[PDB]
Amino acid sequence: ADSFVIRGDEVRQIAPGQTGNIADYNYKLPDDFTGCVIAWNSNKLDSKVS
Amino acid sequence: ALGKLQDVVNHNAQALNTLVKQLSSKFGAISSVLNDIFSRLDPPEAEVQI
């Protein structure tokens, strides 16, 4: 179970064989991946007024 | 007068030529060169065309 938090439009980069900053610098998935990915919005708990 | 022998030669050449001509057919894919297939699109469909 790998857990983290990212920006919005970058959620598409968490997939096998995808190109982007997150995929090539932070979190890379194998091309032969078997598993599942769950992504949901947390704008209420991770956002601050300041 | 020697056409019986010549045919034996000719049937060889054609058999090879046809084989070579099958290396430039797309078989329904985008192109015939596999390197461009690998360099253009994502692995999920690259596997299918390969």
Side-chain angles (χ1 to χ4, degrees):
Chain A
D2 301 338
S3 78
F4 48 83
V5 65
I6 52 173
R7 183 178 182 270
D9 46 359
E10 292 175 351
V11 65
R12 59 88 174 173
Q13 295 180 30
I14 315 292
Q18 293 272 7
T19 67
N21 290 318
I22 301 299
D24 72 352
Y25 290 143
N26 306 112
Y27 195 74
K28 185 58 178 171
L29 279 185
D31 272 300
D32 54 289
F33 178 72
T34 182
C36 298
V37 58
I38 300 91
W40 71 91
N41 190 2
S42 69
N43 198 17
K44 298 183 177 178
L45 294 172
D46 289 323
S47 282
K48 195 160 68 174
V49 183
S50 48
Chain B
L2 291 160
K4 254 198 179 182
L5 292 186
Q6 186 70 59
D7 292 342
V8 163
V9 172
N10 281 345
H11 282 252
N12 179 257
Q14 186 81 246
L16 283 188
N17 279 339
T18 298
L19 201 63
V20 168
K21 301 296 180 290
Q22 275 310 77
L23 278 181
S24 82
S25 76
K26 308 193 287 289
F27 294 130
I30 295 93
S31 65
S32 174
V33 290
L34 72 164
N35 200 237
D36 280 335
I37 293 297
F38 273 137
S39 71
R40 278 312 103 195
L41 56 89
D42 53 353
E45 208 57 39
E47 299 303 289
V48 174
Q49 272 77 348
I50 294 300

